[PDB]
Design a protein around this ligand. Structure first.
Ligand SMILES: CCCCCCCCCCCCCCCCCC(=O)OC[C@H](COP(=O)([O-])OCC(O)COP(=O)([O-])OC[C@@H](COC(=O)CCCCCCCCCCCCCCCCC)OC(=O)CCCCCCCCCCCCCCCCC)OC(=O)CCCCCCCCCCCCCCCCC
Ligand code: BCL
Ligand code: BCL
Ligand code: BCL
Ligand SMILES: CC[C@H]1c2cc3[nH]c4c(c3C)C(=O)[C@H](C(=O)OC)c4c3nc(cc4[nH]c(cc(n2)[C@@H]1C)c(C(C)=O)c4C)[C@@H](C)[C@@H]3CCC(=O)OC/C=C(\C)CCC[C@@H](C)CCC[C@@H](C)CCCC(C)C
Ligand SMILES: CC[C@H]1c2cc3[nH]c4c(c3C)C(=O)[C@H](C(=O)OC)c4c3nc(cc4[nH]c(cc(n2)[C@@H]1C)c(C(C)=O)c4C)[C@@H](C)[C@@H]3CCC(=O)OC/C=C(\C)CCC[C@@H](C)CCC[C@@H](C)CCCC(C)C
Ligand SMILES: COC1=C(OC)C(=O)C(C/C=C(\C)CC/C=C(\C)CC/C=C(\C)CC/C=C(\C)CC/C=C(\C)CC/C=C(\C)CC/C=C(\C)CC/C=C(\C)CC/C=C(\C)CCC=C(C)C)=C(C)C1=O
Ligand SMILES: COC1=C(OC)C(=O)C(C/C=C(\C)CC/C=C(\C)CC/C=C(\C)CC/C=C(\C)CC/C=C(\C)CC/C=C(\C)CC/C=C(\C)CC/C=C(\C)CC/C=C(\C)CCC=C(C)C)=C(C)C1=O
Ligand SMILES: COC(C)(C)C/C=C/C(C)=C/C=C/C(C)=C/C=C/C(C)=C\C=C\C=C(C)\C=C\C=C(/C)CC/C=C(\C)CCC=C(C)C
Ligand SMILES: CCCCCCCCCCCC[N+](C)(C)[O-]
Ligand SMILES: CCCCCCCCCCCC[N+](C)(C)[O-]
Ligand SMILES: [Fe+2]
Lengths: 238, 301, 281
């Protein structure tokens, strides 16, 4: 029967498709490892896919995956049990060590470039023509921490030009320097911006960017990680 | 308390983004449209510009011709009475030629001719628009993924109003042009073929329909969940994995034992959606041509 | 085993119940209080189902079916073999879904991400409870719920719908179907966009969000933006289920006649009800 042939065939196809799909999704994080960093014995029934190479724009090079996997950074954690499967405790300050919900990845220390080779994220002051178009403008509002103490003030908004979306709030600390805060980790209110993830005393700990008019992928990761990490590690102040 | 990122807290605007030029003929690119602060709370506030080469004009013309062919007939059914037009709006319908005419074009205008005409305009409108999804991609140097996925939708459509009616031997098999009637045609089609729930392809198609909603809910939510680590910048997370992509993968690994990659998830996505109309098109194509009753067919195979 | 970048995230904390009691993993699976709860609820329910399979007389997946109490039992309890097991299994199912959500909330807390996923999952759960709990209870009996069987539940879908004629006429069912169709459309597009950029024509360089916005801008005159499309997929999906739940919560309760006749309120509108011509005149 023709219908019987079609349905039988489709399942063969669907199985091969799932296989393909599962392998495609193994281009990162694999091979699997034991908590000590060595190859795990059991990798599963799915093999690693033949490598593929992405040609990055603006001469940033290429990315070939699968490829040698490495954190390229120290992990300040230690086993808390004699067997696999348990939590690894922060050896130092998780916030400062960047582990747990405060983890950051060692991304490239360059900024993201739009399709035109320009920086994707820039403070609004340096983005020609960009301005707040709707909703309460946070610039000028004082920034309050989960401890209900003011930790600074909003001195600018960092924008994603290609998307024309607000990404960070540049906040000035009492020492005069500034920090970036993920738009999604802040609550813009009528008379202030509220930050639940961090307590006043923790804003200074937020990683800082090298150049004042640009942030790099590596820097964004340390900033976002640190702030999110506050939800768990700030707790004692909130 | 905590922000969810469903609506923007504050919108920003800058010069109208005119987009990448690449190999695109800017002569056919229109000018920017207005900005919608309304749209801005949810997504991008900029309307336009839109590209419109020849194919674009062709497609838009056929499209409107199609719609107007159906609409004029709708008016005629209301006796050109505005009041009757609005109240019976969902009851009007442009039916295909009766069986008697087979696949010919003899059928009178008020008896299938207009349907064939409207159908003709739609055929041109859809296929021209398809070529358009391919070319707009080519002009930007991008892959042809969109045009391929759109083909899967075209498949069901093609099967419903052209391929099946043909194999079946008559245009009477095709779907009528009407809100309620097209629903009736759907119910009747199932009754007439032994109930599609028995059609293995209708069942797979449903799995993917529900699947697309499950997966997009998962994915969409996931990205929003890690948008605080810039997870929405999917292409760059594909080119340089960040903590967003890792937490996304680990939420699912820890939850269900396995996970995706920032690029792969989109492969799961494109197939989940695309298989809805793929399996569906087969299911329908086989109905009446190879299987008259799925319940029956089911009893044997 | 662990993903190459996983250890830094497997730290203590995030649990809602039991402190570090169940704070550990089993292979790739995170456990947690709710991981244990879920297993319990799930194991029981599966066992109770295998038992219903014995009382029904079959081990075949295509045949095993577990029906709720017959209408005559109302909202009370019924003998195990006569709707009791169903009632118990439903308890387990609910217990396992809600536990799964909560487990998710814990995973979120440990990973420092938003609660969007479990929040989304909650809509599915609510759809389920509308069919086996809220609608039944509003209608007066568990018999109105669907049976747990691969094919038998499709029967219930069919009979339930035809009890009102063509279910297509349910106005809320129409909206729900739209979102489902639109969602599938959106998913196909979103996936094809990202992929057409990450995988350009042979030898070319990866395109960019700018290219993505450009592509849709050229194609239809608008691009929702990367944050927007994800906001959209979520919205479409959830809206689709919300309206599904709504299309049924109103069926058999505030409306129990033929859904097609519901549309008469519009046609019978005074200012054109009696005008001749058209389909309804
Ligand atoms: C109706 C047609 C519906 C078509 C739907 C296509 C979905 C799009 C998926 C996809 O990525 O397509 C891209 C793919 C590449 O896009 P591009 O513009 O060439 O370049 C993109 C980059 O250069 C290169 O980009 P790339 O990396 O993205 O493209 C990868 C793609 C490359 O594409 C292909 O290899 C061909 C795609 C054809 C898929 C046909 C599906 C058939 C379902 C049949 C059911 C049978 C039962 C009845 O490979 C796959 O996805 C493999 C699928 C796994 C099949 C497993 C089968 C096991 C069988 C058991 C024996 O498009 C096509 O290959 C053509 C599709 C039209 C076919 C007619
Ligand atoms: C709201 C819709 C109606 C309904 C209408 C239909 C129709 C119409 C169809 C199905 C179909 C299916 N339905 Mg149903 N279905 C309902 C409620 C449910 C519930 C539930 C707890 O509420 C469950 C678990 C299912 C499950 C299923 C799958 C067996 C099947 C296709 C998977 C799919 O589409 O996945 C979307 C989700 C995914 C792809 C994720 C993976 C989900 C896996 C596949 C589900 C496993 C279910 C399992 C076999 C039984 C329980 C597990 C055991 C306890 C261990 N339905 C309600 C009553 N259903 C299709 C079919 O082929 O039926 C024979 C079909 O045509
Ligand atoms: C009583 C009716 C029968 C029944 C009869 C049918 C029939 C008949 C069919 C389906 C089909 C489908 N059914 Mg069913 N179905 C029933 C019950 C169900 C139930 C349920 C819970 O009960 C569910 C979940 C489904 C689900 C589904 C979907 C999986 C599938 C449609 C895929 C789709 O997205 O097409 C959406 C998309 C298209 C049709 C794509 C084509 C789009 C075209 C190319 C573009 C439009 C161009 C246009 C010019 C632009 C317009 C205007 C501009 C916007 C301005 N059915 C009952 C039992 N069903 C279809 C299928 O494939 O089945 C196998 C089908 O033919
Ligand atoms: C002849 C039949 C009638 C009809 C009768 C009905 C009836 C009756 C119903 C629908 C419902 C629906 N109909 Mg209808 N419907 C018809 C024709 C159609 C057509 C079409 C093309 O013709 C379409 C597209 C639809 C579409 C729809 C959807 C909007 C909706 C189902 C999805 C949903 O709510 O999921 C909601 C999602 C769930 C219920 C799943 C919950 C998942 C749970 C929480 C988790 C499962 C975990 C699992 C057990 C674990 C498995 C193991 C693991 C995999 C390891 N119908 C015809 C006219 N339709 C349903 C609705 O609105 O339901 C609320 C419904 O009840
Ligand atoms: C894998 C299957 C899924 C899918 C995929 C899919 N659809 C697609 C694509 C893809 C990948 C495209 O690339 C293509 C697209 O361009 O998307 C934006 C498309 C598309 N899917 C569409 C529709 C569609 N897809 C559907 C479904 C699905 N699409 C599946 C779920 C459905 C249904 C029934 O569920 C519909 C209705 C089209 C919007 C678009 C293809 C457009 C096209 O062919 O246009 C040709 C003709 C016209 C210009 C039409 C004109 C009609 C006018 C008379 C309208 C209004 C006139 C009037 C109002 C003017 C005044 C305006 C006032 C409002 C002010
Ligand atoms: C709300 C909108 C959409 C959505 C979202 C959604 N679903 C989700 C999530 C989200 C956000 C998750 O996070 C969660 C997930 O883990 O993803 C893989 C999940 C999930 N959606 C699932 C299924 C599912 N979702 C569906 C639908 C949808 N999910 C919507 C379209 C459907 C259908 C029919 O459309 C199904 C079948 C699960 C794979 C997974 C949740 C897994 C889970 O809860 O595991 C705990 C329990 C067990 C392992 C076993 C329970 C066994 C017994 C106790 C009971 C079974 C009895 C009976 C009720 C079943 C009988 C079935 C018959 C009808 C055949
Ligand atoms: C950008 O980001 C993203 C990711 O990362 C990069 C992702 O991966 C994902 C995830 C998505 C995928 C991997 C794509 C494929 C997913 C689907 C098609 C969805 C449907 C899902 C399934 C069929 C699988 C369901 C499996 C389940 C529920 C596991 C059940 C099984 C078990 C053996 C363990 C059960 C037990 C419990 C209770 C806890 C463990 C405890 C004990 C054993 C005790 C998304 C959405 C994402 O957006
Ligand atoms: C990239 O994002 C997006 C996705 O992701 C991949 C999506 O999936 C989806 C989901 C898709 C849908 C919900 C369906 C498709 C949507 C539409 C058909 C409508 C979208 C169109 C608009 C919102 C507005 C169109 C605006 C136009 C045509 C204005 C153009 C401006 C001018 C012509 C300027 C005037 C100048 C003149 C006349 C000079 C000559 C959307 C919307 C999306 O956007
Ligand atoms: C009041 O304002 C004025 C402008 C009149 C506007 C009013 C217009 C209105 C109210 C329009 C309403 C239109 C509606 C309701 C359209 C509805 C369509 C629906 C509900 C469903 C569509 C299903 C159609 C399908 C599956 C069509 C498939 C078509 C094909 C596969 C192509 C077939 C082509 C054929 C037969 C041509 C043959 C010719 C050759 C040789 C190639
Ligand atoms: C991306 C593809 C993954 C989706 C796999 C969906 C599996 C659901 C299969 C259920 C329907 C079975 N059938 C033949 C009885 O209808
Ligand atoms: C019909 C679709 C249902 C599929 C159920 C399969 C769930 C797979 C869980 C796999 C993860 C396994 N593990 C432990 C090796 O990681
Ligand atoms: Fe995405």
């Amino acid at each position: 029967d023709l219908a019987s042939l079609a349905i039988y065939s489709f399942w063969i196809f669907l199985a091969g498709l799932i296989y393909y799909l599962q392998t495609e999704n193994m281009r990162e994080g694999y091979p699997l490892e034991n908590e000590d960093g060595t190859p795990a014995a059991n990798q599963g029934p799915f093999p690693l896919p033949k490598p593929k190479t992405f040609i990055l724009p603006h001469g940033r090079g290429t990315l070939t995956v699968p490829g040698p996997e490495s954190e390229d950074r120290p992990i300040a954690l230690a086993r808390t049990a004699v067997s696999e499967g348990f939590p690894h405790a922060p050896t130092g300050d998780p916030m400062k060590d960047g582990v747990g919900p405060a983890s950051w990845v060692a991304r490239r220390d360059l900024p993201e470039l739009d399709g035109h080779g320009h920086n994707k994220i820039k403070p609004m002051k340096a983005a020609a023509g960009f301005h707040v178009s709707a909703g309460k403008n946070p610039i000028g509002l004082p920034v309050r921490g989960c401890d209900l103490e003011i930790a600074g003030k909003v001195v600018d908004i960092w924008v994603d030009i290609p998307e024309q979306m607000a990404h960070f709030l540049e906040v000035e600390l009492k020492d005069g320097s500034t920090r970036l805060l993920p738009m999604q980790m802040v609550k813009v209110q009528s008379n202030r911006v509220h930050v639940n993830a961090l307590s006043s005393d923790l804003f200074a700990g937020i990683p800082t960017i090298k150049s004042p008019t640009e942030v790099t992928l590596l820097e964004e990761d340390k900033i976002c990680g640190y702030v999110a990490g506050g939800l768990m590690y700030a707790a004692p102040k909130r | 308390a905590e922000y969810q990122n469903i609506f923007s807290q504050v919108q920003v605007r800058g010069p109208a983004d005119l987009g990448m030029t690449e190999d695109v003929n800017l002569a056919n690119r229109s000018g920017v449209g207005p900005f919608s602060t309304l749209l801005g709370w949810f997504g991008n506030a900029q309307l336009g510009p839109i590209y419109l080469g020849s194919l674009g004009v062709l497609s838009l013309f056929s499209g409107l011709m199609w719609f107007f062919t159906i609409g004029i007939w709708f008016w005629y059914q209301a006796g050109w009475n505005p009041a009757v037009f609005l109240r019976d709006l969902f009851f009007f319908s442009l039916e295909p030629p009766a069986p008697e005419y087979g696949l010919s074009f003899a059928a009178p205008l008020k008896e299938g001719g207009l349907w064939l005409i409207a159908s003709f305009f739609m055929f041109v409108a859809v296929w021209s628009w398809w070529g358009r999804t391919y070319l707009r991609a080519q002009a930007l140097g991008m892959g042809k993924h969109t045009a391929w996925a759109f083909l899967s939708a075209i498949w069901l459509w093609m099967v419903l109003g052209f391929i099946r009616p043909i194999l079946m031997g008559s245009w009477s098999e095709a779907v009528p042009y009407g809100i309620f009637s097209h629903l009736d045609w759907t119910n009747n089609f199932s009754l007439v073929h032994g109930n599609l729930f028995y059609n293995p392809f209708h069942g797979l198609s449903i799995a993917f329909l529900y699947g697309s909603a499950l997966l997009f809910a998962m994915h969409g939510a996931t990205i929003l969940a890690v948008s605080r680590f810039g997870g929405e910048r999917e292409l760059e997370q594909i080119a340089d994995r960040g903590t967003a992509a890792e937490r996304a993968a680990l939420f699912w690994r820890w939850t269900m034992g396995f996970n995706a990659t920032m690029e792969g998830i989109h492969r799961w996505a494109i197939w989940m959606a695309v298989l809805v109309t793929l399996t569906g098109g087969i299911g329908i194509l086989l109905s009446g041509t190879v299987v008259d009753n799925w319940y029956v067919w089911g009893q044997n195979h | 085993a662990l993903l190459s970048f996983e250890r830094k995230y497997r730290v203590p904390g995030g649990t809602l119940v039991g402190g570090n009691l169940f704070d550990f993993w089993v292979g790739p699976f995170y456990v947690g209080f709710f991981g244990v709860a879920t297993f319990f609820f799930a194991a029981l329910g599966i066992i109770l189902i295998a038992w219903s399979a014995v009382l029904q007389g079959t081990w075949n997946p295509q045949l095993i079916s577990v029906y709720p109490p017959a209408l005559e039992y109302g909202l009370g309890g019924a003998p195990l073999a006569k709707g009791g097991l169903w009632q118990i299994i439903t308890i387990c199912a609910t217990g396992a879904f809600v536990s799964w959500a909560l487990r998710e909330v814990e995973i979120c807390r440990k990973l420092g991400i938003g609660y969007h996923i479990p929040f989304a999952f909650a809509f599915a759960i609510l759809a389920y409870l509308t069919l086996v709990l809220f609608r039944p209870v509003m209608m007066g009996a568990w018999g109105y719920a669907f049976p747990y069987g691969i094919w038998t539940h499709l029967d219930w879908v069919s009979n339930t719908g035809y009890t009102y004629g063509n279910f297509h006429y349910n106005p809320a069912h129409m909206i729900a179907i739209s979102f489902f169709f639109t969602n599938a459309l959106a998913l196909a597009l979103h996936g094809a966009l990202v992929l057409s950029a990450a995988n350009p024509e042979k030898g070319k360089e990866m395109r960019t969000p700018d290219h993505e916005n450009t592509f849709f801008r050229d194609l239809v005159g608008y691009s929702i933006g990367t944050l927007g499309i994800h906001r959209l997929g979520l919205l479409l999906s959830l809206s689709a289920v919300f309206f599904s739940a709504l299309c049924m919560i109103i069926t058999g309760t505030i409306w129990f006649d033929q859904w097609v006749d519901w549309w008469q309120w519009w046609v019978k509108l005074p200012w054109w009800a009696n005008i001749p011509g058209g389909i309804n005149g």
